Amino acid sequence: ERKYLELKSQKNLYLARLKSAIAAQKIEEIAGNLDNASASSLFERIETKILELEAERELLNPPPSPLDKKFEQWEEQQAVEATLAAMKARRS
Amino acid sequence: LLERLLGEMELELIELRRALAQTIATFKSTERQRDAQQLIAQRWYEKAQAALDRGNEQLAREALGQRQSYQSHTEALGKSLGEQRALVEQVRGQLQKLERKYLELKSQKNLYLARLKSAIAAQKIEEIAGNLDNASASSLFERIETK
Amino acid sequence: ILELEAERELLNPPPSPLDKKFEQWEEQQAVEATLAAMKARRS
Amino acid sequence: AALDRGNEQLAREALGQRQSYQSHTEALGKSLGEQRALVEQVRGQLQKL
Amino acid sequence: ILELEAERELLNPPPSPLDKKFEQWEEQQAVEATLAAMKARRS
Numbered sequence A: 001e002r003k004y005l006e007l008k009s010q011k012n013l014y015l016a017r018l019k020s021a022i023a024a025q026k027i028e029e030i031a032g033n034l035d036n037a038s039a040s041s042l043f044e045r046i047e048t049k050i051l052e053l054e055a056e057r058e059l060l061n062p063p064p065s066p067l068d069k070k071f072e073q074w075e076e077q078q079a080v081e082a083t084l085a086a087m088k089a090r091r092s
Numbered sequence B: 001l002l003e004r005l006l007g008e009m010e011l012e013l014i015e016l017r018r019a020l021a022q023t024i025a026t027f028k029s030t031e032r033q034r035d036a037q038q039l040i041a042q043r044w045y046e047k048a049q050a051a052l053d054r055g056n057e058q059l060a061r062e063a064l065g066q067r068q069s070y071q072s073h074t075e076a077l078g079k080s081l082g083e084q085r086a087l088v089e090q091v092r093g094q095l096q097k098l099e100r101k102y103l104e105l106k107s108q109k110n111l112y113l114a115r116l117k118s119a120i121a122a123q124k125i126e127e128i129a130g131n132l133d134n135a136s137a138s139s140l141f142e143r144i145e146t147k
Numbered sequence C, E: 001i002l003e004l005e006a007e008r009e010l011l012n013p014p015p016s017p018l019d020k021k022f023e024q025w026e027e028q029q030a031v032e033a034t035l036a037a038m039k040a041r042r043s
Numbered sequence D: 001a002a003l004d005r006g007n008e009q010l011a012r013e014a015l016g017q018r019q020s021y022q023s024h025t026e027a028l029g030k031s032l033g034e035q036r037a038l039v040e041q042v043r044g045q046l047q048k049l
Helices: A002-031 A038-060 A066-090 B002-052 B057-129 B136-146 C002-011 C017-041 D008-048 E002-011 E017-041
Strands: none
Touching: A002 B002, A002 B057, A002 E002, A038 B057, B002 B057, B002 C002, B057 D008, C017 D008, D008 E017
16 A cells, blocks of 8 residues: 555656656747747748848948948038037137 | 747646646645654654653663654655755746746847838838839839920 | 645745845844834933 | 845845846846847938938 | 757757856856955945
C-alpha cells in the first residue's frame, strides 16, 4: 500500500512535467518565428518590401546629392551670418 | 496572421499558467503529509518522553524503534521536497522570462505595423508623385501645352 | 482547497522573505521612532 | 532605509533586485531614443509631402 | 521532454561560459559600483 500511493503520488508529478514540454514546445515553436523564419521572415520580407518601395521614390524623386549638401550647408552659413550681420548691426 | 498567431499563444500561456499551479499544489500537499508524519513521530517522541520517566528505559527503546520507521518516511519524503523546490523555482523563472518576451514581441508587433503601413502609405503618394516630367498627368499637361 | 489557493498565489504572489525582513525591520523603527517622539514629547 | 541603522547586508540585496529593473529600464530606454528618430523623420515627410 | 528542450537550445542558444564570466564579473562591479556611491552618498 505504501508503494502504490507513492507510485500514485509520483504519477501526477510526472504529469506535471509531461505538460511542461508540450507547454514549453508550443511557445518555442512560435519563438522560432525570429530571424529568417516565419513571422520575422515575413517582417524581413516586409522590410525588404519597405526598402523595395523607398527605392522606387529615389528613382522618380532622386535624393539630394552631396553637392547640394555642401551648398545648402555652405549657403546656410551666410544665410544665418548675413541675416544676423544686419540684425546685429540694426540695433548694435 | 500576426493577430491570429498570437491568439493561440494566449491560449498557450494560460495553459502554462493553469496547470503550473498544479505542480505547486502537489508539492505543498507533500509538505502537509510530512508534518503529519512528523506529528505522529512527535507523538511517539512525546510518548517516549513519558517512557523514560520512572526509571524504565526498556519501553523508551521500543518507542523510538517505531519512530525510526516514520523517520525513514520523514527522511525520504523530506529529501523529495528539497529536490522538487528547484523544479518549481526554475520553471517559474521560465514563465517570468517567457512572459516578458511575449509582451515585448507583442510590444514590437504594432511598431512593425507602424512601418508596414508607411511604405504602403508612402508608395501610394510616390506613384502619384511620378506624374511629373513625361509621365501621366504632367505628360498630359506636356501633351496639353504642346496642344 | 489546496488547488485553488495555489491559483491566487499565481495571480496574487505571496510576500517574499525580503519583504518579511523589511516589514519587520521597518516595524522596529516604525514603533521605536514613534515612541521616541512620544517618550520625549512629555518625558 | 536598508543602510540605516548600520545593516548594509540588506541594502546590497535590495540593490540586487533593482539591477533586474535597471536592465529593463536600460533596454527599454534605449528603444525610446531609437524610436524618436523614426517619428521625427516621418513627420518631416508628411510636412514636406 | 529532453528531445523538445534540445529544440529550443537550437532556435534559442543557451548562455555561453563567456557570458557567464561577464554577467558574474560585471555583476561584481554592478553591485560594487552602486554601493560605492550609496555607501559614499551618506557615509
